[PDB]
């Protein structure tokens, strides 16, 4: 007391609804007096008492004089930052956790674990922080580019599970899982199955026995690699999601990849991190996913659901369950997380809405949140409200 | 540790006095360095330990570049925000609770309940949040425009009661009440009586048995619909206030509506949300109300009181208690709320003082507060001090 | 637990030293990005866990557009505000307690009592707040200008004692004391003796039996009225301080008021609020006082001490104990307060250092703090560092 | 509940890695909206629950109008400030602890002790604060310039140990140590041995019996004076570090100082505060140190280590562990500190990275942090990212 936390049955509900928008650049005008941080790759993770809104900053504000380089991914300035969910992530409201150009975090019931990867591309370093204390590291194993989830890690009974990967962006990237306890890496887990390229896994609990993840293959396919990780045996297997509703971007037309479930198909090169979250019921499991409305561009974001079945074997379309972001608006990375009610867990999906005007201006993002709430159908979409000219 | 709260006897006193002004736009000059949020529909709710100042933001600051649209009511950016009462609601001080263009909130003794309506006009959606967790929703039942109080909900023994309404702004809007316990709707209450238009109810406890509300009829009368809700039987009845002192704006001359108490009279179309709060004594009930100084414009705010009687039956004029805002200053929405002293409750009325310069400039509000304190007569009025040209 | 607090023996020490400067206008440049509040009449009060830095704001920031009127004393915008001692009192860091143009506050061991006077000059109103709750008021008794200390009130065993006064600035102003318990006025105390003009009393505990105050006579003398208030009998007597070291400004030459201790003497018109704090030892009492270095202008601030004797009867000079502010710098109001160490109390004097460029610019103040610490002599003076042109 | 803290065994690890950069002036552009404080002499200290980032401010922000004087050391405006480690030290985020132009701080397990020296050069004064209470002072003993560590003090079983010194910058400065318990000085410690110039000691626990410090000789040598302080007997001895790897700046070529360990050698005048921190193992002690990459300029910062031996006697070169700051970036003061994990202590070194544009512009610093974490080799360097023209 505090005790370790475990996944619980989800709170009652049958549809997602628009919850909250964090749009810091609504206050970034030259005519204004604010200092929203320039960020990308936001995610959210919650503990028993609060939710934290994380991102990777370029250590620059709007308005400001350091826009050059903010459309790049890795440099010596990027840091993992957070605010309490609902606060605007400005220079003063934010806290800087560690130097990082790839990140994750999660709460185990007693304390926060923070994860940050930095260093040179060919010998990068994963760093683990438990509360205030730097407690461990893990090294690049392919010497191409070590990296992690860009979303919440997952803790059960004090054991926090985390995807890492290393490899070429356009070739092989075989992922691993780390088992981390009170900030220290106590096991490495080497998945079996379809392992040729797995990155940016969005993971969560299907049950007390099983973690599942929906990931990105940046090289070979528009189907998402789907991880099943058994936390009783510490073993993992990966296969492609068979659904006709391909969740990557870019992607070919739904159902158009012919042959069996493992077939790679066309337009596999490139990709995007995708939302995935679980609705755990007594004898039923809802799997909720998001994908861009556009097949080729990072525009729009749609929500989908399927109950039960085996995602490795089932070609049936996921059920469309609403436009979270219309195709007129940006829809970039998406992620899952869960908010802890008094006796049950609330599944949510967050959406990174990038403000992209190219390399000659600033480059950052808003965060939209949708959560399971009540019944019926999803009723309204999200806009950032930002005019990049101001 | 902690216990559910109940209404208590009011603290001793016999007059209201000027307490506190929150005027964020005193700091919004182009020459300044601050970021007060552009808001409307402020209200206040208190729990056992603190009071919170809530409002509906347009997700824009002064100074800034997003003034266009701030004189409108509903859009995809409006959010329910709060600060601790006494803090200036700026970009950084504020917390964003949820997307909402109509709102409410209340503390039950253990935790905050937050209420926000958003969605499209014909199928809007009321959302309930308990602490950090989104917990329930309620649907549009007239498909016209679902909406709520714009003031505090009211909790007793863990059951929080909330007015909602749905229907045409210039036609029929039959309200209902929701009973919400730990974030979930456990009962609907369908009022009887004079029900054809009730909105923006300002509600409080007359006793442990009864909640009363003074509301707005936007279509048919300048008399306020007056709700009596029995919390023991979970039933409600509504009739017009019979007092000659018509509390709406616009309104005709006092007492000039002829016929029985239910007669509607002249200047019924249009309206304004009105202040109302109870002073609960051992063998006596005081009802305190506010209305604009102008009969037809949102200018000034006067305080009135009457002890005992039946508001449905008594045509007696309310006793004029003093000028809270001069007819030279804006007087828009007003609301009641109660502060928890150690052993008794302090009744207060808040006043929204809108800065209205038309649709070619920014549109926002200050919040003035008067509370029951000491004896004698009300001594001083409130100004916003804001020059909209700066 | 929390229990009521009482004055304790003072911590060991024999000289004051420079502790801390709060100079918010060091960040008020047009070239800067900050919002220090425009204030005057600062004071400090501490409880068992923290110290609060209070002041009276004009509800305006530097830089800003509302400088006009900030060299005035009373208006409908002035408010009592505070920050945690050590924080810069800006728009966002501060909290607004109540509308007030005269103020006081104190902690009783369990909760804060806040005191604010506002209203029209001829019928002003003292308002009492206990925590968040407005709990009582007190009315003007001379209908000239009700006002209070502009420094900490004093609580013992739950009873908080407060000076109020009412009367002409250039004639009679007979003060009273209020005894306030958990926010409610439970006794009025009418002093005897030399009562013709007593205002802006700076008060503290000489012992568990006695509160003493050093006050301002704005009409008749440059000697300070000295209150002795017996908290066992709730009786008070006032006589002039007899010391040759006249503490008011303006003042004639030291010792130059001829005749007995009660003689008024010359240059009595005008005045200033003066610092006074107690050093309580086992069989000895140190009385520490401050006065401007200039006899006629609000420039400089010197510290003085005398041990034992009767301030009503003793003409001996107070011992000069250091320049806190040189005559080159502003020295306006001064006040006493005590910080609570684990087992003993630390006496301190604070100094308002007003930035005065006349009525055509902004008008505000810094706060300097000196406290009893160690042995020897007071070693360094304080400057605000502010160039009013920036 | 709570207990006094003691040094514990260090957490497992064998290399340092880049942890965190605090670079406030990334947000100080004329085009921006922030107010980073102008500071120098940053350090860090941690207690059982949080780490605090301390520095000495010139009481001025960037952008602003008070740059003149910010390249000086001592004045009446300098103050010791802090934020929680990871927050940007701005006007509003920071807390001002006391007036000080030399500083230290440390947590004893129950409460913070804050140390600040101010006053005139010939009779300066060290002030001790415990929590909010000013509790003691210490006087100048050489009347030249009393000063302290500019890094964390060290507490064991409630006794906090602090280096102080006094004397000429280019002549003799014989240091002493103070033993402070709950804010009060309970013992003086007068070192023996090589005492002619010791300042800016960076100190830590070698064990429960022994504190060690690596210090600056500004007059006579580029070898660092090295303190061994026995906390059981409260006595101290000092001798020069014998290592060929001279840690001061300026310095001659490594190993080029001929003669016995106490020989002073070439380029003795001038100096810099140096990083030093212990890695305490069961049967082994690691000593980690930092020095600039340039022999003569404050450019770059390299990390070094040696296990066991006697630093007074061993001429052996320290093992070069990696580049923390490239010779293209500023490397000024460095310091050691330790973070408290649940059951072990994590050693770190911090680096002040001064933005030096000469006396015609602003002068301030970023703070970079490296900590022991994992195994392998140190992988990445730190840049401030600041363009002083913006
Ligand atoms: C997973 O296992 C945990 C731990 O056993 C379950 O949590 C327990 O649930 C039971 C039944 O509600 C309670 O009596 C215990 O107090 C819970 N302990 C906890 C949360 O620490 C949890 O229900 C399981 N999750 C599932 C089935 O999804
Ligand atoms: C409404 O009911 C509540 C609950 O019974 C009353 O609160 C109690 O008041 C009594 C007498 O003052 C106290 O001894 C109890 O401790 C209170 N109980 C709780 C749980 O708070 C309250 O007084 C009633 N209010 C009115 C207006 O009658
Ligand atoms: C004034 O009276 C208070 C209350 O009696 C005294 O505080 C007590 O002091 C004794 C002796 O140190 C302690 O044992 C008690 O625990 C104290 N109780 C408290 C503070 O609540 C205080 O010492 C007296 N002040 C004087 C003599 O200046
Ligand atoms: C220094 O001494 C402290 C105090 O004895 C040691 O802390 C104790 O360590 C033991 C064994 O790990 C624990 O069982 C105790 O609970 C600790 N006591 C306290 C009061 O903390 C510490 O281990 C010693 N450090 C070194 C480096 O030897
Ligand atoms: C090049 C590797 C990887 C997969 C393409 O690039 C990611 C793609 C990104 C993207 O597609 O938007 C942004 C990520 N921040 C980046 N990750 C890292 C660690 O740089
Ligand atoms: C249009 C319905 C209703 C009655 C006219 O409008 C309200 C009136 C308002 C008003 O009269 O000032 C402002 C309210 N924000 C608005 N409410 C909503 C939900 O839009
Ligand atoms: C006119 C009454 C009183 C005594 C002169 O004036 C005070 C003097 C002041 C002064 O001498 O600086 C400032 C005080 N804020 C003012 N008090 C009030 C309540 O207005
Ligand atoms: C003048 C004495 C001392 C040694 C040269 O100067 C220090 C050197 C400094 C330096 O070498 O950068 C900066 C320090 N802030 C300063 N300390 C004080 C107390 O002024
Ligand atoms: C930044 O742009 C400058 C020109 O403005 C160019 O020299 C440099 O290569 C750019 N660097 C990065 C990392 O984009
Ligand atoms: C404000 O927005 C409306 C609706 O889009 C548009 O018609 C109008 O031109 C805008 N006003 C200005 C000043 O741009
Ligand atoms: C403020 O100054 C204006 C002119 O700038 C003048 O009309 C007015 O009287 C002033 N008011 C006060 C209260 O000083
Ligand atoms: C800075 O201050 C010094 C000392 O007062 C003065 O000599 C110099 O002229 C000042 N510099 C500028 C640019 O004003
Ligand atoms: Ca792909
Ligand atoms: Ca009407
Ligand atoms: Ca006088
Ligand atoms: Ca040297």
Residue numbers in the entry:
A (entry chain B), B (entry chain A), C (entry chain B), D (entry chain A): 76 to 465
Please give me the paper's original passages concerning this structure:
The neuraminidase inhibitors (NAIs) oseltamivir and zanamivir are the antiviral agents available in France to treat influenza A or B virus infections. The NA active site includes catalytic residues (R118, D151, R152, R224, E276, R292, R371, and Y406; N2 numbering) that interact directly with the sialic acid substrate and framework residues (E119, R156, W178, S179, D/N198, I222, E227, H274, E277, N294, and E425; N2 numbering) that stabilize the active site. NAs are divided into 3 phylogenic groups: influenza B viruses, group 1 (N1, N4, N5, and N8), and group 2 (N2, N3, N6, N7, and N9) from influenza A viruses. I221 (B NA numbering), I222 (N2 numbering), and I223 (N1 numbering) amino acids are highly conserved framework residues in NAs of influenza viruses.
We are the first to report influenza B viruses, isolated from an immunocompromised patient after prolonged oseltamivir treatment, with good fitness carrying a novel I221L substitution (B numbering) in NA that confers high-level resistance to oseltamivir. We used X-ray crystallography to understand the structural basis of resistance to oseltamivir conferred by NA carrying the I221L substitution. Crystals of the NA-I221L protein in complex with both inhibitors diffracted to high resolution, showing clearly defined density for bound oseltamivir and zanamivir. The structure of the NA-I221L-oseltamivir complex showed that the L side chain protrudes into the hydrophobic pocket of the active site that accommodates the pentyloxy substituent of oseltamivir, thus causing a change in the conformation of the inhibitor such that its C81 carbon moves about 2.2 Å from the wild-type NA bound position. Viruses isolated from an NPA collected on D34 and a nasal swab specimen collected on D40 were highly resistant to oseltamivir (IC50, 1515 and 1776 nM, respectively) and showed reduced inhibition by zanamivir (IC50, 24.3 and 27.3 nM, respectively), compared with the first wild-type isolate. The Km revealed that the I221L NA variant had a 1.9 times lower affinity for the MUNANA substrate, and the Ki values for oseltamivir carboxylate and zanamivir showed affinities that were around 84 and 51 times lower, respectively, than that for wild-type NA. In comparison to the I221T or I221V substitutions, the I221L substitution emerged in an immunocompromised patient who underwent prolonged oseltamivir treatment and conferred an increase of >100-fold in the oseltamivir IC50, a much higher fold increase than those seen for the other substitutions. In our case, I221L substitution in NA of influenza B virus isolates induced highly reduced inhibition by oseltamivir, with IC50 values greater than concentrations of oseltamivir achievable in body fluids (ie, sinus fluid, middle ear fluid, and plasma) under single and multiple dosing regimens.
